[PDB]
């Protein structure tokens, strides 16, 4: 599978990872992309069982701060698709080693400050918006590398 798509964090419904497996199955490129699914929480077997159902390449576990840095290596993008007014320690971390992140615009959520434009955004909960922002990345690799190094001198900044 030549697209992974990673999401760290707490399986919760404050982290909404149902839109993100949702907007995978609803992708131009379904079969290209694989989640990888990272964390612990109430959700688990629920998400799991989504994924499955919807037929949506996922990989689940967890991972601790040193392993993460490992997984983003091999990403193609990370998406952030909480509400809630989460942690985003995953999502600074991505952008950090260059990756470019979607990110739902909640306005109570801190992490959409991540996003250097639209591209980088999707609605709260919208999963057919989410599927096309994904869709438009894995579609144009030379402003996805672009933007994985503008990325990684924001997040510095950020830092």
């Known amino acids: 599978t030549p697209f992974k798509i990673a999401m760290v964090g707490r399986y919760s419904n404050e982290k909404n990872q149902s839109v993100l497996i949702k907007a995978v199955a609803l992708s131009k490129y379904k079969q290209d992309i694989v989640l990888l699914l990272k964390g612990k929480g109430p959700d688990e077997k629920k998400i799991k069982l989504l994924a499955q159902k919807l037929g949506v390449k996922a990989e689940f576990g967890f991972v601790n701060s040193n392993e993460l840095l490992e997984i983003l290596k091999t990403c193609t993008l990370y998406v952030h698709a909480a509400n809630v007014e989460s942690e ?42 989410l599927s096309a922002k994904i869709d438009w990345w894995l579609e144009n690799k030379l402003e996805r590398e672009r933007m994985q190094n503008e990325y990684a001198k924001s997040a510095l900044n950020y830092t």
Do not use: H, M, W, Y
């Not at 991505?94 to 109570?108: D, E, Q, T």
């Open 88 to 129: 985003a320690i995953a999502c600074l971390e991505a952008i950090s080693v260059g990756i470019v992140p979607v990110i739902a615009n909640s306005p109570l959520s801190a992490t959409r400050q991540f996003a250097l434009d639209e591209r980088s955004l999707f609605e709260p909960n919208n999963a057919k918006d």
